[model samples]
Target: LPALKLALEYIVPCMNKHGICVVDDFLGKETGQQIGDEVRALHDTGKFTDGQLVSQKSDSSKDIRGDKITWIEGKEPGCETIGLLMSSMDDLIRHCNGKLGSYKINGRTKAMVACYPGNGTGYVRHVDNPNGDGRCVTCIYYLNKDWDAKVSGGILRIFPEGKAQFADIEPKFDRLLFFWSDRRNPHEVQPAYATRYAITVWYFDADERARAKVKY
Candidate 1:
């Protein structure tokens, strides 16, 4: 509930003007820890799978990005907390569409809970929606408790548009980051020295889904 206000107050303006924004205390520390715990428990149950590049499906996909992922569909066990996240994110998407600039955001993708194993693995810089797969906005919620940026090394280096300097953001607990999914924002993950958890949701454009249905 509080995050909704933060989203509207901070994310809306920054996402519009800068195409990127980061909010701390997103959904509270307790809720964030619970979500992180669920992922750890799920990982123990072996629910996660290797992440793949949507543009190119290859064995080398792991080389490009090294993270294990599991989708939160709300039916899975211990998904109650993530369900709340999904709903809140949907509400944020709706709010943005109602008061946004040329976004035309309609729906969202499933929350992909990804764990970056502490194996010096990192993702290459790339746009989330390179070929215009309808993903207009990207939301990432971090869940690394007591994360030390200087030591952990899983900093998100965002090359924001209209800026010469880049932002090396730490994956601090309950930190939710939002940015444009298209070329306006190019980013990458630095090698993680410790296990890092994050959940992502991509807001989609209305016309993209319409085109998909029309072809069917």
Candidate 2:
């Protein structure tokens, strides 16, 4: 409940001005650790796939990036951690939509755990709304405990619109990064020196399948 309150009061304002918001105490310490353990367990089970480019189906050539991902959906087991996250994120999204005075987000959502193997693994600058995903908001929660910028090179570089400089965000433990999926806000992940793990969630405006019917 406190997290939800904080999101509405603080997160929304920050996002409106800068197009991005970062909260350090995203899920609290105990809960954050639980979710982090679950993500790591999923990775150990080989549930993740190679991170792909926005335009490509798969990362066959492995040129664009080297991160791995595991999608979480529906009411599947072994996903309680992310399940809670989905519920909380929904509340946050609703608050954002109301604050912005725009129907930018609906209930439709998708989530994934991304693992970037060390030694220069990262994603190129891109927008999350590509591929007709209808993505309106992107929320990423870091699972890397004791992460140091010196040891890990996977800083989230957010290029804000009309700004000469970009905002560099560290993927620290229990931190949540939220941003709109606008074309002007292009972002990239710096190559990581150490393995990095994170939970990436996206809220859609509508079912992606329906986007084909709407002519806008």
Candidate 3:
């Protein structure tokens, strides 16, 4: 808990200092396990899907399903679910001295447990931006307890240099990735050799005007 709080303090200032920052070992071993269990429970309920199922991504802006989310909202498989995870996220934001909350947009907080199956092909490279009428933050909670080092090709690449600087994250349980979205922070999910699982939650500030055409 102390480490997490310190990390949060570091992260908030780091984000304020730089355009973006990535920290490893942010989640301790135990917290990671709890979150991992939550993701798996949600997945077993069979509410997750690839972004292509409900929308198209060739046109990035219109790719709502792929980019926006795979939301299942209020209805979930288990009592301890993403909604619960979201509550934790809200508190985490508060710990960082940032106000975080979500409203019912599509019957829930626009949070979902998303799965990217390996067919040797996954999402093509793309960039994203915040929609709606508030400050947008995209968070992904990775849940791959048994993520194999071999044939698990999923990697997140950030275009920090206007190209790709790869951040190799194993789909390990409790791995959380968060980034500010404003069309400038372009990123992509490299094709995975196996199924990739994650629970994603979007955070929007209550003051809608705070998110007006801001670039990160």
Candidate 4:
């Protein structure tokens, strides 16, 4: 009911139009808090590993991103609640594009939980599927409470095409952000002065993925 609401009411309607959009109250603040707490516990347990820019050397990669990442299969003990979001997204995306549009996305990458520790660390500008791999759409859900965007930083800034200034989207609680995963939306995670938590899922185009697999 809820995720489907998101697809029709927001995601499906403008994913192609705006190229990027941030919708508030993805699943509600209460659920967001549960997700936030679950992630924090895992972070404390050291489940997250250092993130790196693939194909880049150690120093340059290290200099670029400072977030720790962990993929969720959704079967883990503490991952139950957030898993609903993970699973529901699979259905939502499948319904939105696969059954409704020419894009016809058929699959997705595993959802990733990323934790960026406070201390001015963040990710540099990048696009999800530069080419091949078929990651056509990228969606992110924020799991932060008591967040102060102006004070905490970690804002996601997207450089939209033909625009002089970039757009800023805060990592606010229960917010869902989605965009086409191409040069259409070049984005970066600004330096964070406080800890940040977000989960991301990327859906893939069926034929595009098949082509990428063959090329690889």
Candidate 5:
């Protein structure tokens, strides 16, 4: 819990002030590669399908995103990757609840593994809690090994409130990016020149307020 203890100390202040935080090498390179390999193996089974775009407004659309996705349920068969990742997150969730109110980081943790293929694949700007889902926090762990900023285009762009400019976070190996899921922090992903792999989890306050239902 040393790393997560330090991360909570670092992340809380940043999130309190700017609504977002990026910490590199959160899980170390070795673990990142291992998780990436597992997800890739799942992809080999042709399990990943086109990610859907949910809309708070009238019409739903997938035109904005072009990544393949698969849900990472807890302790399921063929889910060694999800199991390890959730094990790590369990500590973080406890840390968060202890620091913030229990209401701040509520409900069980849920996650998804995503892959953005090279050659202009990305998601448009959007907020995680677009609908009434009480998504309070979002964390993304990048697994792109040997990522080069010069060639990698899948940057996670975060828009801070009251700033003319935004923050661009490169999807580097073992990097962890997290932020509040409210409307104040709109974000988007740029196209990737090389294949990009990432695991994303959203923390909610209640089960009814969790993300849309998924058919795992």
Candidate 6:
């Protein structure tokens, strides 16, 4: 668990300096399995639409903005099923805030939760809290079962250089991906080969401001 603590410490400074952090092997298997089921059920239910769905092509335009893509809202069934799993995030975040030093609301911000289906492909390479004012944290909870490195090509490429060098997260279940919103940590996801599933959620300690600069 020290890895988790180390990541939190490192991430706080990382965000302050570079605006992002990449923590590997963050979630265990059981939780991953359950989340996978929740996402699959939703996708199977025919809830995701095209506009809210997206494709990230190698040569496509780069800017990913707005609530243009279709998504499912409200409580995902598995969240309740996992009891402590769902609430553990609050503990971790509160710990993170405490260790990093909590700050008051800069302005009225927002919390967003959306599911992405592999069949529809997700967002293009874009920043969520792009305005450079809001969107303090960006978190993704992976929900996929039997996700293989070979078949699951829904890797998330993070261009944290504020220039280019990108890091990636394979489409694996229960994996939690997080980063800050700033020029340095701009990122994007390539179109997935299989049905990559996950919940894209955001945490904004500040108020929503102007949209971020869209890059294509």
Each prediction's TM-score versus the true structure: 0.87, 0.85, 0.67, 0.88, 0.82, 0.66
Best by TM-score: 4
Which window of ten consecutive residues has the lowest lDDT sum in model 5? 207-216
Q: Residues 53-164, candidate 2: write the lDDT tens digits.
A: 4334456554554788877882578779778877777777776676742535665656878888885768889888756656767888898889998777899998987888
Kindly report which residue stretches of model 4 are placed more than 4 angstroms away from their true locations once superposed: 51-65, 98-101
lDDT of 1: 0.80
User: What is the Å distance of residue 46 in model 2 from its true position?
Assistant: 1.4
RMSD to truth, every model: 3.9, 3.9, 6.9, 3.4, 5.5, 6.8
TM-score between model 5 and native: 0.82
- Per-residue lDDT of candidate 3, residues 1-216 (tens digit): 553565466656665554355544445567666656665565575545534644557886755443223564534555354566666665665565441223221211456666776655456655555354443556667767667646687776666534355445565665666665545456777767776777766655544534433622
* lDDT by candidate, in order shown: 0.80, 0.77, 0.56, 0.81, 0.74, 0.53
Model 1: per-residue Cα lDDT over 108-158, one tens digit each: 888898888877777889889877777788899888889997988999999
Off by over 4 Å in 2: 50-65, 130-133, 206-212
TM-score of model 3 vs. true structure: 0.67
Candidates 2 and 5: which is better by TM-score? 2
Error of 5 at 162 (Å): 1.7
Task: Name model 3 segments beyond 4 Å from true.
Answer: 2-4, 19-38, 41-45, 49-81, 98-108, 130-135, 146-150, 161-166, 206-216
Ranking by TM-score: 4, 1, 2, 5, 3, 6
